[PDB]
C-alpha cells in the first residue's frame, strides 16, 4: 500500500506537467513575452499537429485482440445510466432543456485521459494501468465524441427550422444545404428558400445570402449531411482511422513498423505532451479571471466532476463484477479533471462556454489533492 515510496513516483509523473504550465501563464501575465496574436499561433500548432500525432502514437500501439472487455463494459455502462436520467428530466419536467443536457453529460463523464490520465495512472499502479487508459481513449475518440457532434448539429438544425418555419414546417419534404456552408448557426446570413410544388409540399434550400416539426425522415438526412462535413475537416478523425487500421494489421501477422516511418512520426509526437500543457497555460492567462462564471456555478461544475462522476461509476463497476485493483483504477480515472475536447465544442457552438472554461482550468489546479485523496483512501 501507500509507502512514501509511492508518493515519490506520483510526484515524478505530475510535477513536470505543472512546470510546463506556469511558465506559460507567467509569460503573458507577468513577464510579457507573448502578444495575444502570438499566443494564437502556438495554440493552433498544438491543436492541429502535436495532439493528433500524440494520439496516433498511443492507438497504433494498442492490441485490439487483447482488450479487457469487463473493464471496458463498466465504462460504457456509466454513460448509459447518466444519459438515461437526462432523458427522464427533459420529458417529465418543463424546465429541462437541450442546452443543459449537453453540458451535464460532459461534465460528468468525459475526463482528460490523454494528457493527464496516462502519466498519472501509470505512476500509481504500474504499466498495465497505463494500457488500460489507452483502451478508454480509443472509445472516446471513436464513439463518445461522435455522439456529441450529433447532439450539437441537431441542436443547431432545430433552432433554424423552428425559427423560420413556425407555422408551416410540417409540409417540408426535402432540405438541401449548399456546399459553401459548414455550420448553420449565426455567422453568415443564411437565406433560406422554399419551392412550392404541385401538391403544396415545400422543398427547402438553404443558400448563403449576399450583402410542429418536419417528418423524422427529413430531419435525419439534414443532420447526416452536416455531421459528415465537420468530420472530414477534423484532424482527430484521421488519427483514429489510421491508428486502428494499422493496429489490426500489426498485431495479427506480427508486422513491425519500419524505422524510417516510426521516427518521422516520433519527431513531432515527442513535442505533444509538453506543449499540450504549455498551451493550456496560455488559455488561463488570456481569460480575465480564473473562476470565470461566478462562485455559484463553479462549485457546481466541480461537484459534477469529482463527486457525481466517481459515484455513478462505483455503481456501474460493481454491477459488472470488477473487484480488487481494477475497481480502484476505475474510480480514479473518473475523478480526473475536465477534458479539452468538450471545451472546443462549447466554444464553437456557444453552449455554456464559461462553465466548461472554469472546469478545464480550475479543474487542473485542484485535481491532484483530490485524486491523491482517493488513492490514500482506497488503499486503506
Amino acid at each position, epitope marked *: 500500500m501507500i509507502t512514501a515510496a509511492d508518493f515519490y513516483h506520483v510526484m515524478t509523473a505530475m510535477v513536470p506537467l505543472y512546470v510546463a504550465m506556469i511558465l506559460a501563464y507567467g509569460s503573458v501575465k507577468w513577464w510579457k513575452i507573448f502578444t495575444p496574436d502570438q499566443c494564437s499561433g502556438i495554440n493552433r500548432f498544438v491543436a492541429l499537429f502535436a495532439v493528433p500525432l500524440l494520439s496516433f502514437h498511443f492507438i497504433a500501439a494498442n492490441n485490439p485482440y487483447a482488450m479487457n472487455l469487463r473493464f471496458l463494459a463498466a465504462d460504457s455502462l456509466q454513460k448509459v445510466i447518466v444519459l438515461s436520467l437526462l432523458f427522464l428530466w427533459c420529458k417529465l419536467s418543463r424546465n429541462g432543456s437541450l442546452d443543459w443536457t449537453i453540458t451535464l453529460f460532459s461534465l460528468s463523464t468525459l475526463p482528460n485521459t490523454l494528457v493527464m490520465g496516462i502519466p498519472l495512472l501509470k505512476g500509481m499502479y504500474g504499466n498495465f494501468s497505463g494500457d488500460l487508459m489507452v483502451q478508454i481513449v480509443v472509445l472516446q475518440c471513436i464513439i463518445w465524441y461522435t455522439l456529441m457532434l450529433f447532439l450539437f448539429e441537431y441542436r443547431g438544425a432545430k433552432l433554424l427550422i423552428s425559427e423560420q418555419f*413556425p407555422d408551416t414546417a410540417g409540409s417540408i419534404v426535402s432540405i438541401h444545404v449548399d456546399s459553401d456552408i459548414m455550420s448553420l448557426d449565426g455567422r453568415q446570413p443564411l437565406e433560406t428558400e422554399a419551392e412550392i410544388k404541385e401538391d403544396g409540399k415545400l422543398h427547402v434550400t438553404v443558400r448563403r445570402s449576399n450583402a410542429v416539426m418536419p417528418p423524422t425522415s427529413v430531419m435525419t438526412r439534414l443532420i447526416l449531411i452536416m455531421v459528415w462535413r465537420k468530420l472530414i475537416r477534423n484532424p482527430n478523425s484521421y488519427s483514429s482511422l489510421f491508428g486502428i487500421t494499422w493496429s489490426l494489421i500489426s498485431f495479427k501477422w506480427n508486422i513491425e513498423m519500419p524505422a524510417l516511418i516510426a521516427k518521422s512520426i516520433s519527431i513531432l509526437s515527442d513535442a505533444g505532451l509538453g506543449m499540450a500543457m504549455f498551451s493550456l497555460g496560455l488559455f488561463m492567462a488570456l481569460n480575465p479571471r480564473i473562476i470565470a462564471c461566478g462562485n455559484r456555478r463553479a462549485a457546481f461544475a466541480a461537484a459534477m466532476r469529482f463527486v457525481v462522476g466517481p459515484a455513478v461509476m462505483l455503481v456501474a463497476s460493481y454491477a459488472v463484477g470488477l473487484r480488487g485493483v481494477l475497481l480502484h483504477v476505475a474510480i480514479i480515472q473518473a475523478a480526473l479533471p475536465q477534458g479539452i475536447v468538450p471545451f472546443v465544442f462549447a466554444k464553437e457552438y456557444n453552449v455554456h462556454p464559461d462553465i466548461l472554461s472554469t472546469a478545464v482550468i480550475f479543474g487542473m489546479l485542484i485535481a491532484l489533492p483530490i485524486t491523491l485523496l482517493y488513492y490514500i483512501l482506497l488503499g486503506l
Partner: nanobody, 116 residues
C-alpha cells in the same frame, strides 16, 4: 394551413417595345410581411434581382438597368402585387417569379416571359 399556394400569370410572346402585366397572388398564410420581389433567370447562371415592394413603399430597390421604368403596385387586403413593364427591350426572355417573405422566402416557377 389549407395548402399554401402561389399562382402567377401574365406570360406570352409579344413584340419588342410594348407593355406586359405580371401578377403574384399569394394566399393562405400567416401574417404576411411585405418584402415581395421579382427576379430574372436566363438558362445561364448568375441571376439578378429586379424590383421590391418592401415594408411601406419608402424605398424600392430597382436594378441598375431598369431605373425608373417599372411600375409596382400593392394591395394589402387583396394580397397581390403587379409588375408592369414598359418599352419592352428584346433582352427580356428570362424567367420572372415572385419571392414573398414570411420569414423564409417562398416562391413558385410558373411564368412564360418572352419577347421578340
Amino acid at each position: 394551413s389549407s395548402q399554401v399556394q402561389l399562382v402567377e400569370s401574365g406570360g406570352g410572346l409579344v413584340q419588342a417595345g410594348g407593355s406586359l402585366r405580371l401578377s403574384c397572388a399569394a394566399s393562405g398564410f400567416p401574417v404576411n410581411i411585405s418584402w415581395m420581389e421579382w427576379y430574372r433567370q436566363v438558362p445561364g447562371k448568375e441571376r439578378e434581382w429586379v424590383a421590391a415592394i418592401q415594408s411601406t413603399g419608402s424605398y424600392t430597390w430597382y436594378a441598375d438597368s431598369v431605373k425608373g421604368r417599372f411600375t409596382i403596385s400593392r394591395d394589402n387586403a387583396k394580397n397581390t402585387v403587379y409588375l408592369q413593364m414598359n418599352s419592352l427591350k428584346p433582352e427580356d426572355t428570362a424567367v420572372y417569379y415572385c419571392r414573398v417573405k414570411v420569414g423564409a422566402y417562398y416562391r413558385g416557377q410558373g411564368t412564360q416571359v418572352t419577347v421578340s
